[PDB]
């Protein structure tokens, strides 16, 4: 418990791999949409004979609620998603600082877990000697 809290603790969140069968005009929203929900473009492709793309992307599960509808709302219903979890990404922001970017979900995790308000720092769990 002590040793974890001295080595720059971080939290890692699961990442979907999402691939989209979308036509040409509506793909532009995805690049706009993803950077508003931290989505990451992996690769673009088009099926031979049809004009629709097939574009693969990484979206953290965090920003993945209601995502298709706004994708449906942004694309006029023309884009169609296929959704699957791929891997985990590490949060760049500190999850120890209560006012940090990762420090709100963990505080919410404290809210849903019943734990204290303060997060255990490395000062506790460690007998200084």
């Amino acid at each position: 418990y002590a040793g974890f809290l001295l080595a720059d603790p971080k939290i890692q969140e699961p990442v979907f791999l999402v691939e989209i069968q979308c036509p040409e005009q509506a793909v532009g929203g995805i690049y706009s949409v993803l950077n508003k929900k931290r989505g990451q473009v992996v690769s673009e492709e088009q099926r031979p004979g049809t004009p629709l793309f097939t574009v693969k992307a990484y979206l953290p599960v965090n920003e993945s609620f209601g995502f298709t509808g706004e994708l449906r709302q942004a694309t006029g219903g023309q884009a169609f998603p296929q959704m699957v979890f791929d891997h985990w990404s590490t949060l760049g922001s500190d999850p120890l600082d209560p006012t940090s970017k990762a420090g709100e979900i963990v505080l919410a995790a404290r809210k849903r877990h019943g734990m204290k308000e303060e997060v255990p720092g490395w000062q506790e769990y460690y007998d200084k000697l």
């Binding site: 004979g49 049809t50 006029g76 219903g77 023309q78 169609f80």
Partner: protein, 254 residues
């Protein structure tokens, strides 16, 4: 829900002899499932799509070929399903836009050319000829709400009973560059300016003309025009349904 419904239709020799199908008998039995078209019910239809070989893709003329229309139509073509295309809500197009003779003809062309692009873009290379053609009789026009529609092949026969006209090639004559050329009685293939007063098409001249004239009687509630044309129109009425006004007289007559 997607439940099959039973539908039974007898028919006479002239229309069963004119059937290019591997089959035998005089009876046809139609089993139809009404899947809901909501795109978020895309799984109730994908099971529903598989169970059949023909699919009735209903398309609205006002909104045109919409986004979800394309999607399920591509889904049907994924299974190699032969489609029949029916456009509803002509009454909407004939009462909201009031497109008189050519715009209605042109708008139909817009959609059918649009859908023909889709079937030519998504025809699998085992059938090839899944293309839809109003000339081939796979496209109808009518009002689902009011419960009336027509087919060119059904309409193609109605004329030789009074003109003695050929049937084989007039079914594909109703579309494209071919013009009835009234005042001359010749199915010309170009306007040619008619030496002045450029001449009309057979489609506009023959089929839509009675339709729009009846509306003028009906949609303005013109009591003086109903009885004369209906007798020319070889239809019958009932003892009491004659006494119905516009937007409801139209329903029963067609």
């Amino acid at each position: 829900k997607s439940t099959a419904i039973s539908l039974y239709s007898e028919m006479s020799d002239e229309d069963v002899k004119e059937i290019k199908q591997k089959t035998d008998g005089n009876s046809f039995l139609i089993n139809l499932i009404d899947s809901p078209g909501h795109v978020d019910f895309s799984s109730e239809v994908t099971a529903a799509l598989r169970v059949t070989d023909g699919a009735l893709v209903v398309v609205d003329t006002i909104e045109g070929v919409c986004v979800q229309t394309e999607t399920v139509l591509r889904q049907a073509l994924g299974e190699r399903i032969k489609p029949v295309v029916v456009i509803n809500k002509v009454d909407r197009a004939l009462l909201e836009l009031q497109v008189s003779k050519e715009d209605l003809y042109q708008t139909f062309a817009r959609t059918v050319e649009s859908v023909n692009v889709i079937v030519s873009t998504y025809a699998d290379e085992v059938l090839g000829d899944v293309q839809v053609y109003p000339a081939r009789g796979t496209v109808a026009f009518g009002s689902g709400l009011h419960g009336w529609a027509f087919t060119i092949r059904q309409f193609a026969t109605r004329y030789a009973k009074k003109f003695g006209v050929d049937k084989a090639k007039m079914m594909d004559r109703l579309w494209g560059d071919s013009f009835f050329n009234p005042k001359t009685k010749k199915w010309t293939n170009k306007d040619t300016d008619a030496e002045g007063k450029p001449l009309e098409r057979a489609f506009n001249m023959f089929i839509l003309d009675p339709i729009f004239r009846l509306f003028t009687a009906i949609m303005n509630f013109k009591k003086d025009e109903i009885p004369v044309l209906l007798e020319k129109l070889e239809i019958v009425l009932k003892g009491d349904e004659k006494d119905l006004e516009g937007k409801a007289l139209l329903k029963v007559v067609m």
